mmCIF file of C-alpha atoms in Angstrom:
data_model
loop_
_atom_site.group_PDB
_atom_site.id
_atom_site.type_symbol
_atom_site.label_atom_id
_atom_site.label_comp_id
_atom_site.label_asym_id
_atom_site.label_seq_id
_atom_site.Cartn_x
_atom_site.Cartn_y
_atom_site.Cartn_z
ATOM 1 C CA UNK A 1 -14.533 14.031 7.902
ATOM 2 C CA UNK A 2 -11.161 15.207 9.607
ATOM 3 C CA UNK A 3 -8.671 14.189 7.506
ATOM 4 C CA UNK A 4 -4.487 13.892 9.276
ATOM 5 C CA UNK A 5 -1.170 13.958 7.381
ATOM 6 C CA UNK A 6 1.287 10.834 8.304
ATOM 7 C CA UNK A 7 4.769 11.352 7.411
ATOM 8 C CA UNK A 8 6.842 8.178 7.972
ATOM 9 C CA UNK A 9 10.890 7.435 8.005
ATOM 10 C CA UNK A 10 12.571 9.029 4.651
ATOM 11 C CA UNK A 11 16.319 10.703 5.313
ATOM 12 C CA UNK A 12 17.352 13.348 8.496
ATOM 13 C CA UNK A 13 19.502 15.954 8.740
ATOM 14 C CA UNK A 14 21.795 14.297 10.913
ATOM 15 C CA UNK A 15 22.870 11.934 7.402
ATOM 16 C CA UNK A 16 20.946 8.813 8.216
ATOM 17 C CA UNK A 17 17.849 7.020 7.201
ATOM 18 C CA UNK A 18 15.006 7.604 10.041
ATOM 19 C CA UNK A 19 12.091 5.741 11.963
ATOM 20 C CA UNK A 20 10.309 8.371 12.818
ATOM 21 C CA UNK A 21 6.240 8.714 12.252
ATOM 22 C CA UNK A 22 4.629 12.139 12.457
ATOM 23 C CA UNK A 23 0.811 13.033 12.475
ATOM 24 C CA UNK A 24 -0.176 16.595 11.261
ATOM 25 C CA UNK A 25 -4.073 17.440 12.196
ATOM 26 C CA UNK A 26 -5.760 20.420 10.490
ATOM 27 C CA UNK A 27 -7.822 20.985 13.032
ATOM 28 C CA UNK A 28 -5.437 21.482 15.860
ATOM 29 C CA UNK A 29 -2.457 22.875 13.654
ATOM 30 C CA UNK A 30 -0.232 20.810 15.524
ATOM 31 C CA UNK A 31 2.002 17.741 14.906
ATOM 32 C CA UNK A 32 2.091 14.810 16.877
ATOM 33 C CA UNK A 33 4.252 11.405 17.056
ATOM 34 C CA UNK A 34 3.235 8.428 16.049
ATOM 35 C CA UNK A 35 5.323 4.935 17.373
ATOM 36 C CA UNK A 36 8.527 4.538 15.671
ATOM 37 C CA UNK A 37 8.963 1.901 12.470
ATOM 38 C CA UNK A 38 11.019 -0.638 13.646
ATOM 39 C CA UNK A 39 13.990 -0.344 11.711
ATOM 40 C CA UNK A 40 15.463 3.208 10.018
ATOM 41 C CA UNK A 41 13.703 3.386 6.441
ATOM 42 C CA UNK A 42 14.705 5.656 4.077
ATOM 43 C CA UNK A 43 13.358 6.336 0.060
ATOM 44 C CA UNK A 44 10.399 4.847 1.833
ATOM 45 C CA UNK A 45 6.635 4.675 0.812
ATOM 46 C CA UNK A 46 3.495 4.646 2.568
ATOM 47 C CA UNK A 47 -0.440 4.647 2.312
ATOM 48 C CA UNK A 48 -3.092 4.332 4.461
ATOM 49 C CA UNK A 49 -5.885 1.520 4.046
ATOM 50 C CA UNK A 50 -8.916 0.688 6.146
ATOM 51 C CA UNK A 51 -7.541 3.057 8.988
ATOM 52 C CA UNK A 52 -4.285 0.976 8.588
ATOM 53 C CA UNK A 53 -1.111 2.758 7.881
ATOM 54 C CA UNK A 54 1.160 0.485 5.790
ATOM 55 C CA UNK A 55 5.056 1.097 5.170
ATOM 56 C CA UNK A 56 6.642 -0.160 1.949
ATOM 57 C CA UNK A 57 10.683 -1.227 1.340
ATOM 58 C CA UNK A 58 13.124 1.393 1.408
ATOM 59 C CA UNK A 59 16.464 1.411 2.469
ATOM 60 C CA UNK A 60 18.061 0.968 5.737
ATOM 61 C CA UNK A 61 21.539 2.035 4.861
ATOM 62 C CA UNK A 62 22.935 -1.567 3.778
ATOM 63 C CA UNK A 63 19.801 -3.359 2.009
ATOM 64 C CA UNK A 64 17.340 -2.392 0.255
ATOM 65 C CA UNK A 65 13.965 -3.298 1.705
ATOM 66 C CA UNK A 66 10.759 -5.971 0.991
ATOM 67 C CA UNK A 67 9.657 -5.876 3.786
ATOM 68 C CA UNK A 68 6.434 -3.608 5.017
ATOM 69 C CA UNK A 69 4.829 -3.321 8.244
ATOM 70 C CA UNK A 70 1.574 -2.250 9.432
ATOM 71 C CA UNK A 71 0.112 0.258 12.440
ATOM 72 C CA UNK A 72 -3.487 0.194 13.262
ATOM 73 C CA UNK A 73 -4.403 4.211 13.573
ATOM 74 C CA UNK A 74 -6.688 3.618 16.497
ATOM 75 C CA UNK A 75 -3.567 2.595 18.494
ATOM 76 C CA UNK A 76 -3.295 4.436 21.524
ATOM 77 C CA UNK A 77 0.067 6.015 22.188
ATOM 78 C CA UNK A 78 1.470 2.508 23.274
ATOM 79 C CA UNK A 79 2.261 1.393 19.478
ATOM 80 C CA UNK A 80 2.817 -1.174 17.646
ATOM 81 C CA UNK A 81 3.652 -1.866 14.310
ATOM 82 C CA UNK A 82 3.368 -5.092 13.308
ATOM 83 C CA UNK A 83 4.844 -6.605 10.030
ATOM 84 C CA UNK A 84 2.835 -8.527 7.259
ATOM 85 C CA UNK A 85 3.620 -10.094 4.252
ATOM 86 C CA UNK A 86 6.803 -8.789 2.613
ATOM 87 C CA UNK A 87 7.205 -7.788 -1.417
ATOM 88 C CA UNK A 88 8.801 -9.954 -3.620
ATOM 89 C CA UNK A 89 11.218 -7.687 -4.637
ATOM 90 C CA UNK A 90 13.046 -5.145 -2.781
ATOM 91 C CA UNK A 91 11.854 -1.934 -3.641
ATOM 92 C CA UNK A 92 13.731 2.009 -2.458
ATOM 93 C CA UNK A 93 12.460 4.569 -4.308
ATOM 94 C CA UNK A 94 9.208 2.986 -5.290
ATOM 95 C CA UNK A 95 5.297 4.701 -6.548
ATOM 96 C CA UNK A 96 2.378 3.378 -3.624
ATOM 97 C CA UNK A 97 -1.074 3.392 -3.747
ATOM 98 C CA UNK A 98 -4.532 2.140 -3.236
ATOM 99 C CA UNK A 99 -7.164 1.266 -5.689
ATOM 100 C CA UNK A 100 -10.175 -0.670 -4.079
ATOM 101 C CA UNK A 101 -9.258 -2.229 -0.808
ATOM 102 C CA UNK A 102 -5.466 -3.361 -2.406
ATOM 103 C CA UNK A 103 -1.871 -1.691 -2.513
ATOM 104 C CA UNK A 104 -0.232 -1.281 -5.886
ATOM 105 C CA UNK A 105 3.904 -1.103 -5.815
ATOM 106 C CA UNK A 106 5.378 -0.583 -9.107
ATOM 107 C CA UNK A 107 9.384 0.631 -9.836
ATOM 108 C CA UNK A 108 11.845 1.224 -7.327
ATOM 109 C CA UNK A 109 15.631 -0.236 -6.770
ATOM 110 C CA UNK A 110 16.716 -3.181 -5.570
ATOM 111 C CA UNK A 111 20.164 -2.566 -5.219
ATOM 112 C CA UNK A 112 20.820 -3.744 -8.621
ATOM 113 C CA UNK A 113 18.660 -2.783 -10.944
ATOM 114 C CA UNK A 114 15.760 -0.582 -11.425
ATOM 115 C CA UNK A 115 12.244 -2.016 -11.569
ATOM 116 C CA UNK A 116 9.839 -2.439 -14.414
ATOM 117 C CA UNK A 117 7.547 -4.796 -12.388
ATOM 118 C CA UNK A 118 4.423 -3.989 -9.949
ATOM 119 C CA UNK A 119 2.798 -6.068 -7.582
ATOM 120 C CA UNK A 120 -0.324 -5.875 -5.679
ATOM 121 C CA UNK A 121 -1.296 -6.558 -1.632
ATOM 122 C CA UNK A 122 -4.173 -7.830 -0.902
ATOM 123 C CA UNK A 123 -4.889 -7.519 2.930
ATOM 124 C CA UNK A 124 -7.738 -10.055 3.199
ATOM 125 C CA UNK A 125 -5.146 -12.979 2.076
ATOM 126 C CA UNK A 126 -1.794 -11.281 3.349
ATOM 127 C CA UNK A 127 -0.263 -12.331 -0.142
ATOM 128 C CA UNK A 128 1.568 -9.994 -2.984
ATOM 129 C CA UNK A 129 0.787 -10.291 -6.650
ATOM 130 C CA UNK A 130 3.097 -9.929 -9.506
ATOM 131 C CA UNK A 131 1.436 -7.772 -11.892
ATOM 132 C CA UNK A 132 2.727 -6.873 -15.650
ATOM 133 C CA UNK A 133 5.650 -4.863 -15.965
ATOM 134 C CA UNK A 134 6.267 -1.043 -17.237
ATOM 135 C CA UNK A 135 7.644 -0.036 -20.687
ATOM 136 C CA UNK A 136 10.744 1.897 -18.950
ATOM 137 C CA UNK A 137 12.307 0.467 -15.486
ATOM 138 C CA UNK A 138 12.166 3.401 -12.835
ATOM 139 C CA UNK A 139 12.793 4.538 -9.478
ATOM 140 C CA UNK A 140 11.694 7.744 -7.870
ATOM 141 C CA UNK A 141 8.707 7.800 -9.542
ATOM 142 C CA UNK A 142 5.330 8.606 -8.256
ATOM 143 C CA UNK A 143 1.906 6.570 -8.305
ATOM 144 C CA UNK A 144 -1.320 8.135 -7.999
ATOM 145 C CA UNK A 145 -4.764 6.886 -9.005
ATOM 146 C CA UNK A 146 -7.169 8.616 -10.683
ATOM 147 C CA UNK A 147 -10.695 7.329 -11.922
ATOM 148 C CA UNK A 148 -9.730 3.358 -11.684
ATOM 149 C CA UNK A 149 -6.686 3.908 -13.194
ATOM 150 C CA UNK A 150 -2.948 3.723 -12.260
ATOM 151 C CA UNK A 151 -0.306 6.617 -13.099
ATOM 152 C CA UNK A 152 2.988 6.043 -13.038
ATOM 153 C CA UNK A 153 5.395 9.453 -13.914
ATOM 154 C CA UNK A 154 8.824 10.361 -14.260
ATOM 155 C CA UNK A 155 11.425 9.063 -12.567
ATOM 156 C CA UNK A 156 14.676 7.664 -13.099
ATOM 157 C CA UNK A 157 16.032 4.550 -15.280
ATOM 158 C CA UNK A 158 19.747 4.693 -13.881
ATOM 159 C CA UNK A 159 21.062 7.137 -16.821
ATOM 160 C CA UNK A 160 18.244 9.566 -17.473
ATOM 161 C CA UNK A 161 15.763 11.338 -15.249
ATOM 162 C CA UNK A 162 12.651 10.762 -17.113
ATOM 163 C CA UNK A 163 9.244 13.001 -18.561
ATOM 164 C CA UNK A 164 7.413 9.379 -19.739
ATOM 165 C CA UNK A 165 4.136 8.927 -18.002
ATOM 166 C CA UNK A 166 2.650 4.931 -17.964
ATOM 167 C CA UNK A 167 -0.892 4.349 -17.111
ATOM 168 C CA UNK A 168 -1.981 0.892 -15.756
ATOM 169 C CA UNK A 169 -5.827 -0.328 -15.977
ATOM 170 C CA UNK A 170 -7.078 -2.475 -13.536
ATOM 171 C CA UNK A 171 -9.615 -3.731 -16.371
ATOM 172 C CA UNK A 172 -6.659 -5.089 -18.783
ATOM 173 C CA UNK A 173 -4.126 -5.466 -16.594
ATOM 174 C CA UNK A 174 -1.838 -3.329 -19.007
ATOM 175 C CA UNK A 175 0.102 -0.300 -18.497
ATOM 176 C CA UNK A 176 0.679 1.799 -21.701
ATOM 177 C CA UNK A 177 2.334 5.315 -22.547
ATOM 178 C CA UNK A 178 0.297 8.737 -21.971
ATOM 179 C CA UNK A 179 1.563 12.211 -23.329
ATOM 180 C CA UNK A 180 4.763 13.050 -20.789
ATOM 181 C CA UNK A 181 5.210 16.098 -18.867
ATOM 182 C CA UNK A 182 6.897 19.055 -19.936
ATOM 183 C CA UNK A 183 9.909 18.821 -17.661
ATOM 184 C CA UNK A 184 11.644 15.648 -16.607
ATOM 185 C CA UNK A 185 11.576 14.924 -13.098
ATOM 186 C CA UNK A 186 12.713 12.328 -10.920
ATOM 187 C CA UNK A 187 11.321 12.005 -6.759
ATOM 188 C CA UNK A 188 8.285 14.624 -7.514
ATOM 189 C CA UNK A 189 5.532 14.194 -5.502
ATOM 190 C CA UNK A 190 2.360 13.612 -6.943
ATOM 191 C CA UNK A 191 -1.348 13.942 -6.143
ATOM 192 C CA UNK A 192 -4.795 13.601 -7.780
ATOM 193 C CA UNK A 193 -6.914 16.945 -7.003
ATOM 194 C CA UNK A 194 -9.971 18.022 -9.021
ATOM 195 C CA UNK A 195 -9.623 16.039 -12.344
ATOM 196 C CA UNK A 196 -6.041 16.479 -12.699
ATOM 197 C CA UNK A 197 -2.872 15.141 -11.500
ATOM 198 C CA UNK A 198 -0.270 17.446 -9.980
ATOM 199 C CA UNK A 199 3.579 16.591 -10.088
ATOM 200 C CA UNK A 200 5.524 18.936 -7.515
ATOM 201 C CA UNK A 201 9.062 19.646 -7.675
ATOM 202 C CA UNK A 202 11.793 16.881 -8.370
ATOM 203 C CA UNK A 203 14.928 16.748 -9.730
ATOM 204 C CA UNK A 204 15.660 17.251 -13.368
ATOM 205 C CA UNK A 205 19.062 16.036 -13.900
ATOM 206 C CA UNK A 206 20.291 19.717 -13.206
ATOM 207 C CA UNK A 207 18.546 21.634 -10.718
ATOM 208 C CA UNK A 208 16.135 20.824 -8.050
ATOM 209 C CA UNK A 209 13.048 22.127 -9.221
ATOM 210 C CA UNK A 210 9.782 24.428 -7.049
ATOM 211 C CA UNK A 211 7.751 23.388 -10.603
ATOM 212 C CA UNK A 212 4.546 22.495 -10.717
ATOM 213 C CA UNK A 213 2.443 20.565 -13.764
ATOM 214 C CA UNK A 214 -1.015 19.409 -13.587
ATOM 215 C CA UNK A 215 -2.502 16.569 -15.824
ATOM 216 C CA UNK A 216 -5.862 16.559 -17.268
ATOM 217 C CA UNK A 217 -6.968 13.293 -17.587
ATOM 218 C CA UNK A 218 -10.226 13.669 -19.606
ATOM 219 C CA UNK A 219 -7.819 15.742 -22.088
ATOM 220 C CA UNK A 220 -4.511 13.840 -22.210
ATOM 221 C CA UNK A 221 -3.083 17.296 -22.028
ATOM 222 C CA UNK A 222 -0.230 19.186 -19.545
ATOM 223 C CA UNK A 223 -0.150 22.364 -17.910
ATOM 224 C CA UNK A 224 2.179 24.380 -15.802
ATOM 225 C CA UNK A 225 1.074 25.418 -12.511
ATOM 226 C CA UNK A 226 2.296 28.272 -10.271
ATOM 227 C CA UNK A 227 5.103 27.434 -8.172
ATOM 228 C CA UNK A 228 6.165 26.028 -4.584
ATOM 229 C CA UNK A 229 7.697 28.708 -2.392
ATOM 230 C CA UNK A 230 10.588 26.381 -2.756
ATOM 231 C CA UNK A 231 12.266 23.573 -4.797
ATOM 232 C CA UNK A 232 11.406 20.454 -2.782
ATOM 233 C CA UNK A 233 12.951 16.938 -4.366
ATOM 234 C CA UNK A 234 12.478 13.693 -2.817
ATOM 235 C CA UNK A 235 9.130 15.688 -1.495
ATOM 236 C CA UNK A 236 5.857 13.888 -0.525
ATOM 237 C CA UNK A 237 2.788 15.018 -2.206
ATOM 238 C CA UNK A 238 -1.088 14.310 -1.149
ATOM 239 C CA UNK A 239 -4.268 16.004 -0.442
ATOM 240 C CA UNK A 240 -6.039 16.981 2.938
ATOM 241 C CA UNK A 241 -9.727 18.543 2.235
ATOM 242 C CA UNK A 242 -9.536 19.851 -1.034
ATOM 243 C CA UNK A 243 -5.674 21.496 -0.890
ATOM 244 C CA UNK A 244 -2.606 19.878 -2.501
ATOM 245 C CA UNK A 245 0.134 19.427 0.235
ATOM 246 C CA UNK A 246 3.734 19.681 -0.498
ATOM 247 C CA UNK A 247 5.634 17.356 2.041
ATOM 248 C CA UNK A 248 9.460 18.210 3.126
ATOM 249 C CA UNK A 249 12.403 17.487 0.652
ATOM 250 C CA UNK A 250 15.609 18.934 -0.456
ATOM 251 C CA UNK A 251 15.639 22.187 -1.477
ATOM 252 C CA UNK A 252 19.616 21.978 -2.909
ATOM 253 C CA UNK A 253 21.149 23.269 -0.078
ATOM 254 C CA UNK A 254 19.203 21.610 3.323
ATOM 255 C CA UNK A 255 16.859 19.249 4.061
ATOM 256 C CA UNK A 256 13.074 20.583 5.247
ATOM 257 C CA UNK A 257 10.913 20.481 8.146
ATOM 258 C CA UNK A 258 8.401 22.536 6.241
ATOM 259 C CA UNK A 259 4.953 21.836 4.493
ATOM 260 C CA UNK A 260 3.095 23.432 1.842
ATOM 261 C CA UNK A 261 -0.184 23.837 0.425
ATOM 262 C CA UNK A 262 -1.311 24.739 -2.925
ATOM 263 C CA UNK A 263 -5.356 26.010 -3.533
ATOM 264 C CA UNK A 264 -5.988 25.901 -7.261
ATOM 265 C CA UNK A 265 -8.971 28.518 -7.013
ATOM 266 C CA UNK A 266 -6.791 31.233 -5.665
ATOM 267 C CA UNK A 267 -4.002 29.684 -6.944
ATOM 268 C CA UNK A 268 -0.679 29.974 -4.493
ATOM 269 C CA UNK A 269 1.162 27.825 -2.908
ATOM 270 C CA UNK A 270 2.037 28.984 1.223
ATOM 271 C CA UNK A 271 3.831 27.222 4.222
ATOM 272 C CA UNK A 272 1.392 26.177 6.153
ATOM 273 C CA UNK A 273 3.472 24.325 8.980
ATOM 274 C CA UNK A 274 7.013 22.442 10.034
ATOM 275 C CA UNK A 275 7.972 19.092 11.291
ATOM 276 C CA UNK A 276 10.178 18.497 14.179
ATOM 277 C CA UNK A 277 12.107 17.074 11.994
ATOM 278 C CA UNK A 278 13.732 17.682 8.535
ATOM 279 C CA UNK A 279 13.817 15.096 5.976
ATOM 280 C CA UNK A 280 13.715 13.876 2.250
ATOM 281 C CA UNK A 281 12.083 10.717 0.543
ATOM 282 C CA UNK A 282 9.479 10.331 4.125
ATOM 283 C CA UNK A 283 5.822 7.807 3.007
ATOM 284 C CA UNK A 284 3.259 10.030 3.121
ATOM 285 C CA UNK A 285 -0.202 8.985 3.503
ATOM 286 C CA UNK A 286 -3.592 10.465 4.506
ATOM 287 C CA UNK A 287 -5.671 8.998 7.059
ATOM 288 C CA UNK A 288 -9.675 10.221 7.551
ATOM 289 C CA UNK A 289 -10.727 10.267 11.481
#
């Protein structure tokens, strides 16, 4: 039932992209490391599958990244991540998650061009799937599942930050538009708590935002939620034992070490803990012990 935070690569305060892995556990209150990834990843992604933690592209400072690599959580504290099969497409900046027991990529930037496409990892073959494509091409975008189905919001299409929200069923392999949020947002972090799905913070194409919205999904319908004691952009968003957790970011003027959690039934948002480190655009992932 014990439930850890994972926070994994993203951008440091000393101007670079990172490799460095951090467990948070609950229980003890404290933070731990975790083996380095291999190579510096920033605008990185990560989730956490059969006690595996998987992390997805990025960008190393010259290329943008395919590639994805693997630690086993019941490691002891002499590693090692191992790489498996790489994307097809080079993805910073990309939505991650899980549905059943395979990873679902969608978005990102290759360098080039943003991303319309997703594709899907299935661990039993090592092999990833081209799946169908987005309406609108997007990078900073979060994923997040919620009953079976695939969210895709906000973002960025290389002019405009973006309020569209795509959904993506499993059942017709399809993604079509939902009712978009109120504020456009690009590198939110979002999370499925209750029945709806949270979006924290981002960047609106102004100023870098401490909103909060939450999506009903049995209503199609938005609604603002109390704020983070901070803006956070490029911030990591997930859910350890009931509580929404803010993860790092930018808050316009420094990078942070801190993290946040949000209770909807007394409804505020406190700092809970910080890092050793402060960064923006870290994987985050939950892992149950």
């Amino acid at each position: 039932a014990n439930e850890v935070l994972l926070v994994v690569g993203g951008f440091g305060s000393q101007q670079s992209p990172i490799d460095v892995v951090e467990k948070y556990d609950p229980k003890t209150q404290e933070w731990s490391f975790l083996p380095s990834i291999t190579r510096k990843r920033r605008y990185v992604a990560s989730v956490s599958l059969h006690d595996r933690i998987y992390v997805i592209g990025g960008y190393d400072g010259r290329s943008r990244l395919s590639s994805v690599e693997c630690l086993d959580y019941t490691a002891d504290e002499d590693g090692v991540w191992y790489s498996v099969a790489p994307m097809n497409v080079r993805r910073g900046l990309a939505g991650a998650t899980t549905l059943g027991d395979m990873i679902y990529v969608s978005g990102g930037f290759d360098g080039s061009r943003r991303h319309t496409s997703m594709e899907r990892y299935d661990p039993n073959i090592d092999q990833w799937s081209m799946l169908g494509d987005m309406q609108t091409a997007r990078e900073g975008a979060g994923l997040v599942v919620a009953s079976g189905v695939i969210y895709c919001l906000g973002g960025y299409d290389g002019l405009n930050i973006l309020n569209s929200v795509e959904k993506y069923d499993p059942h017709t392999g399809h993604w079509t538009n939902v009712t978009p949020m109120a504020t456009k947002r690009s590198g939110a972090g979002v999370a499925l708590l209750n029945d709806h799905i949270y979006v924290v913070g981002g960047f609106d194409g102004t100023a870098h935002l401490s909103s909060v919205e939450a999506y009903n999904i049995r209503t199609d319908s938005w609604t603002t939620v109390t704020s983070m004691t901070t803006p956070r952009c490029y911030v990591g968003a997930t859910v350890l034992r009931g509580r929404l957790y803010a993860i790092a970011g930018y808050d316009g003027n420094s990078l942070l070490s801190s993290i946040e959690c949000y209770d909807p039934i007394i409804d505020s948002w406190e700092v809970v803990t910080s890092m050793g480190t402060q960064r923006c655009d870290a994987g985050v992932c939950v892992l149950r012990e």
